[PDB]
Amino acid sequence: ANDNSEEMRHRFRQLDSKLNDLKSLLKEIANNIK
Amino acid sequence: ANDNSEEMRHRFRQLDSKLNDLKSLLKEIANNIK
């Protein structure tokens, strides 16, 4: 019993984690300027 | 024997490479300001 939904799902989680890291960095620098 | 998992997979790799390039640019400019 094998499926490829979970691996592309985990790719979605890791790219979403990268997006969340970029959002944290952008909000951090956006408060660092002003 | 053909599958469409690899092409969407390679799309995920190239968009993740673009995300990694954006992360490098954001960390670079974030160190360039301060």
Curated annotation (Swiss-Prot), chains A, B:
Cell compartments where the protein resides: Cell membrane; Membrane raft
Effect of a null allele: Trpm8-deficient mice have severe behavioral deficits in response to cold stimuli.
Coiled-coil regions listed in the entry: 1-34
Processing and modification events after translation: N-glycosylation is not essential for but facilitates cell surface expression, multimerization, association with lipid rafts and ion channel activity.
Top-rank taxon, per record: Eukaryota
Tissue and organ distribution: Expressed in dorsal root and trigeminal ganglia. Specifically expressed in a subset of pain- and temperature-sensing neurons. Not expressed in heavily myelinated neurons. Not expressed in neurons expressing TRPA1 or TRPV1.
Comment text on domains: Cooling agents bind within a pocket formed entirely by the S1-S4 helices that opens to the cytoplasm.
Subunit structure: Homotetramer. Interacts (via N-terminus and C-terminus domains) with TCAF1; the interaction stimulates TRPM8 channel activity. Interacts (via N-terminus and C-terminus domains) with TCAF2; the interaction inhibits TRPM8 channel activity.
Family: Belongs to the transient receptor (TC 1.A.4) family. LTrpC subfamily. TRPM8 sub-subfamily.
Biological role: Non-selective ion channel permeable to monovalent and divalent cations, including Na(+), K(+), and Ca(2+), with higher permeability for Ca(2+). Activated by multiple factors, such as temperature, voltage, pressure, and changes in osmolality. Activated by cool temperatures (<23-28 degrees Celsius) and by chemical ligands evoking a sensation of coolness, such as menthol and icilin, therefore plays a central role in the detection of environmental cold temperatures.
Protein name: Transient receptor potential cation channel subfamily M member 8
UniProt organism field: Mus musculus (Mouse)
